From a paper:
Type IV pili (T4P) represent one of the most common varieties of surface appendages in archaea. These filaments, assembled from small pilin proteins, can be many microns long and serve diverse functions, including adhesion, biofilm formation, motility, and intercellular communication. In this study, we present the high-resolution cryo-EM structures of the Saccharolobus islandicus [name] mono-pilus and tri-pilus and demonstrate that archaeal type IV pilins can also polymerize into dramatically different filament structures.
Residue numbers in the entry:
A (entry chain B), B (entry chain C), C (entry chain A): 13 to 143
Write the structure that this text describes.
């Protein structure tokens, strides 16, 4: 009974250390290439009714704007306030191009977007879906 | 006479907690690579007289329904309120196919079930027997 | 994770050393023939919003202005600090003729320019598309 709790604390912590090391190694690409690395902070609530995505991306480097988004393997087209200035900020990106049927069907779950930067590497956004 | 019962309750429940912990650690891999993350929140109450699960399943993905349950190596059948729509609700599932003679013996105790979702992966469910 | 980082560092260093060797060969030719050669020192920034190009051209020869530039296989027009006086300096020229949206779409990445001097020679300018 005692050995099943120390076997879960270690799993929970190992999920975290590996992710921290992975993030540190991800950052080394932007640190050496000379371009800032954009990563999201917190969670995002993509709206099925409007298509607006409310992210909180933070970047440490140049000011680069996104060009496209990938939803469930289907390409999209971004719009709205897309500049991604330096420092943490809030952006109301309105993606469009995919049929709204998937958006209204998939209400409640947390899908994983892939916003495509102009400069290079993309940023993976895990966004919940609201009504 | 007193220690022989407290050395049995602890063993029986240690099996349960170890199985639940390893089920969580196993479903973590599936939710990590490709599949969903349908897990149980809390503990369920399985009636022994009529037979009805009251599980509290939380999932973030497509709507998937269970197809069969396992109660100590015995396959069962599911019918009732079983659709599992995205979110975290309470589902009343009427289990069937099990004889009403192997459950009332251990009323007031806890067992471990195994629900078989539509998308393949199985979730370990902890249930308490109620008369 | 280590292999990818090592490959990235080696790729960047290979680019830098190849460009250095090429510049050395060009300078050798210029010294042999009698007239100096315009070689860019370091990197350059090209603002997509405005079109002004900041370059660090140097030449150990006569003062020859530049007349045209090549962007993505499309000729353009130049103006501004276009004199290119003898000695290393920091010249700021304004590109003209490129479509603003196309270059705006590529903020952050690096491209290759090709300036056209008046004497009858060209200088390759690798520029970062800032904005």
């Amino acid at each position: 009974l005692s050995g099943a709790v120390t076997a879960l604390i270690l799993v929970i912590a190992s999920v975290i250390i590996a992710l921290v090391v992975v993030g540190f190694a991800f950052g080394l690409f932007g640190a050496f290439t000379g371009q800032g690395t954009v990563t999201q902070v917190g969670t995002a609530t993509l709206s099925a009714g409007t298509g607006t995505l409310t992210v909180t991306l933070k970047n440490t480097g140049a000011a680069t704007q996104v060009t496209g988004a990938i939803i469930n393997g289907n390409a999209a087209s971004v719009s709205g306030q897309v500049t991604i200035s330096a420092g943490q900020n809030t952006y109301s990106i309105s993606l469009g191009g995919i049929s709204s049927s998937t958006l209204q069907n998939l209400v409640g779950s947390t899908i994983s977007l892939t916003l495509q930067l102009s400069n290079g590497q993309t940023v993976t956004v895990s966004a919940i879906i609201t009504s």
